[PDB]
Design a binder for this molecule. Structure first.
Ligand SMILES: O=P(O)(O)C[C@H]1O[C@H](CO)[C@@H](O)[C@H](O)[C@@H]1F
Ligand SMILES: [Mg+2]
Length: 449
């Protein structure tokens, strides 16, 4: 190691204790106080066993540096965003391991208005300060307040729907033993739905596996609950529930791409003429649904930091990525795993259409490969092999995010990830499932060549 490995492009992410530990966390608290504007700092943590001790150590460093700390307790990542913005805090840290293994933990850090702190926007500056900090730990000169009250947060979630138009839908909810079920249970007295709770209790030992609804084994536990109970649809979250995943009444998991266009229609029904931000991986369906609903689609590099700053600069009401991230202007421009399914339940209620029928024609019109990852020996040479092969067809190329190639009736995007050393492929066609398969396989053989 020449730099601390735990400092990634968007967050802190490491194995405990050799990459992340209480001493590093206290130092991160100290260094964070130097980076922020004036004001207190919001702290919350996910269900992982070692997360509270990491939070305390962060608090001690912050308070040794004269920063008041607001402990919002066990929460979702979105509650740190919301409370940071709502309480007008100088910043906030969520202690969350996402879905890294049991010996891993991490942190996501924000400044004022829950604006992200990323490698090029202060995270590496913090890393460097932490790397050179051999000062003795100081003693606390500021106080910690514990603010468990979620009333403003819950009231804010409910303001996105017209509760008198909601029908008593039967919804499977799968927290994966993460944190989402505690918010579900607080929302439920204000909602008419019948909840079928699966893997509902928070448990950092994760008896049913680490929360990841994308893994087919975890996917199926929600699907089975929906089919067996005749639920209208199902929702599963990751551990810190800033990501949500939808299953229609047939148990079929809905590919995240189609939720962007769906949520944009939902939002644009109340906010006419608004702008919608989306990523370049999959586009054609979103552009059409947004335009069809009176909205303005705004193409943006994928990544939550790019999406957010593009949303701010354009006053976009909603931003959506195909990878289960949905951002809402009214929500500090931050992502939420809760707003999306409230908006979907409202849409099903008002329209009388199943979730399946709301997306069926879209999925037939713009079939997509899903995101396919490639670990190759030479990413640059592999990309070149793909572009060389297709050059004679003269595709329209865009480099907003890696390479986007539009051939008319099909297109692809091919990116390197900013969180993993991989190539990520996405293909879509204009209503052609055969073309989608032959092109996807063609590109795959090229990448694996
Ligand atoms: O590995 P990628 O594709 O570089 C980054 C991933 O994590 C980011 C932040 O959470 C997301 O905004 C993004 O859409 C994706 F899922
Ligand atoms: Mg998450």
């Amino acid at each position: 190691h020449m730099t601390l490995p735990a400092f990634k492009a968007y967050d802190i992410r490491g194995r405990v204790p050799d990459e992340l530990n209480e001493d590093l966390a206290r130092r991160i608290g100290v260094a964070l106080a130097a980076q922020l504007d004036q004001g207190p700092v919001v702290l919350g943590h996910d269900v992982r066993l070692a997360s509270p001790a990491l939070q305390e150590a962060l608090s001690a460093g912050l308070r040794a540096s004269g920063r008041d700390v607001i402990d919002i307790g066990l929460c979702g990542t979105e509650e740190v965003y919301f409370q940071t913005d709502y309480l007008k805090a100088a910043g906030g840290v969520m202690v969350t391991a996402s879905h890294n293994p049991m010996d891993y933990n991490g942190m996501k850090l924000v400044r004022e208005q829950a604006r992200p702190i990323s490698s090029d926007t202060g995270l590496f500056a913090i890393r460097d300060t932490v790397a050179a900090d051999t000062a003795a730990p100081g003693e606390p000169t500021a106080s910690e307040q514990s603010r468990t009250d979620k009333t403003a947060y819950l009231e804010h979630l409910l303001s996105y729907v017209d509760r008198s138009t909601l029908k008593p839908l039967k919804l499977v909810v799968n927290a994966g033993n993460g944190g989402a079920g505690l918010i579900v249970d607080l929302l439920a007295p204000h909602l008419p739905f019948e909840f079928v709770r699966v893997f509902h209790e928070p448990d950092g030992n994760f008896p049913n596996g680490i929360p990841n609804p994308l893994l087919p084994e975890n996917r199926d536990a929600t699907a089975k609950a929906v089919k067996d109970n005749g639920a209208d649809f199902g929702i599963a979250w990751d551990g810190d529930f800033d990501r949500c995943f939808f299953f229609d009444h047939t148990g079929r998991f809905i590919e995240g791409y189609y939720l962007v266009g769906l949520l944009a229609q939902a939002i644009l029904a109340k906010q006419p003429g608004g702008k919608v931000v989306h990523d370049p991986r999959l586009t054609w369906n979103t552009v059409e649904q947004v335009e069809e609903a009176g909205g303005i689609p705004v193409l943006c590099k994928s990544g939550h930091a790019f999406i957010k700053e593009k949303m701010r600069s354009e006053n976009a009401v909603y931003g959506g990525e195909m990878s289960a991230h949905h951002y809402f202007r009214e929500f500090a421009y931050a992502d939420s795993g809760m707003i999306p399914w409230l908006l979907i339940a409202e849409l099903v209620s008002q329209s009388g259409r199943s979730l399946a029928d709301l997306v069926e024609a879209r999925m037939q019109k713009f079939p997509c490969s899903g995101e396919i990852n490639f670990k190759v020996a030479d990413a640059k040479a592999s990309v070149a092999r793909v572009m060389e092969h297709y050059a004679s067809l003269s595709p329209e190329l865009d480099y907003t995010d890696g390479i986007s190639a539009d051939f008319g009736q099909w297109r692809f995007n091919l990116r390197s990830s900013n969180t993993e050393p991989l190539l990520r492929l996405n293909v879509e066609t204009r209503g052609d499932a055969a073309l989608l398969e032959t092109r996807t396989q063609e590109i795959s053989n090229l990448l694996r060549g």
